[PDB]
Amino acid sequence: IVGGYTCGANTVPYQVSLNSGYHFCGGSLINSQWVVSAAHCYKSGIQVRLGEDNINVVEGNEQFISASKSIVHPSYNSNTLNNDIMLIKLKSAASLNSRVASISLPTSCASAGTQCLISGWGNTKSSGTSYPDVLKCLKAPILSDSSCKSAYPGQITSNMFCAGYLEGGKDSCQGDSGGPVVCSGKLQGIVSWGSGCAQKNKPGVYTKVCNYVSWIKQTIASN
Amino acid sequence: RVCPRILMECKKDSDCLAECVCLEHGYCG
């Protein structure tokens, strides 16, 4: 997260970290057994970490659970990042508590102008590298399709939306992939891609969760 | 450029996804 503030410990209880040695993507706990993330986050041997704030330091609310199964969306395209979504089933259910809680799925898509919360442990510099210890937050509006498509000519499919600021200066960024974009208490977005971070006229691009609610509720209750 | 927001160590550009490149402190971006 570039431009953001510090969420505070466990105030975003559905945020998880995907770890293979180190933190490399986020995700969102959508019940005690399943997390949603970006399909480009797929790796074999994911460990999922719940109840984190400081990723380097054990504060004892955490739960560490391996992924038992990862189900990349059937129409995922790694060249275009279209359908950039994936479900991870946990090897055990997590315990839900006040630090560890799941986020609802939307019943409709959200409109342009609607303010959302984005979180993650990714890079906080738009030039250079600075990776934080503690979870950062950002509030950012869904931008129009027009303005998205013109920011990224050719690259915006119907499964994506832009959120952020055409001015630059605040955006998500590397190591935030797969993490939540939450608007009115529903998971609308997954952190997916951008051209740089926080660059003027290049807002972040997010997977459009409302286009997938069926496929998720399908997959989850069938696996 | 299309660069996914994953945290990925690299040593050369060609290590990275998509049209990310390998930047100065050994991470894609």
Amino acid at A181: V
Among candidate residues A37, A82, A73, the one with its CA nearest the CA of residue A191: A37
Report how this structure was experimentally obtained.
Answer: X-ray
**How do beta strands B3-4 and B22-23 pair?**
unpaired
Structure token digits, residue A118: 């984005």
How far apart are alpha carbons A118 and A137 in whole angstroms?
6
Structural domain boundaries in chain A: 1-12+103-210, 13-102+211-223
- The minimal CB distance from A129 to the residues B3, B6, B27 is found for B27
B24: chain A residues, CB-CB within 8 Å: 128-129
Residue with tokens 């906080």: A124
Contact (CB<8Å) A81/B29: no
Residue A127 CB neighbour total at 10 angstroms: 12
How many angstroms separate the first and last alpha carbons of chain B?
10
Resolution in angstroms comes to: 2.0
Helices (H) and strands (E) in chain B, counts: 0, 3
Backbone φ/ψ region at A21: left (φ over 0), alpha (ψ -120 to 50), beta: left
A13-102+211-223, which class in CATH? mainly beta
Q: How far apart are CA A56 and CA A65, in angstroms?
A: 17
Domain B1-29, second-level architecture: Irregular (4.10)
Q: Is A84 exposed, middle or buried (0-12, 13-18, 19+ CB in 10 A)?
A: buried
**Count of CB atoms within 10 A of residue A167's CB?**
10
Whole-number Å distance between alpha carbons of A132 and A150: 32
Residue type, A101: A
Homologous superfamily of A1-12+103-210 in CATH? Trypsin-like serine proteases (2.40.10.10)
Does the beta carbon of A147 lie under 8 angstroms from any beta carbon of chain B? no
The beta strands (E) that lie in A107-159 are given as: 115-120, 136-141
H-run or E-run covering A221: helix A213-221
A156 in Cβ contact with A145 (< 8 Å): yes
CA distance A161 to A206: 5
Q: Give residues with Cβ within 8 angstroms of A154, minimum separation 6.
A: none
Task: Kindly identify which residue of chain A lies nearest to residue B9, measuring between CA atoms.
Answer: A24
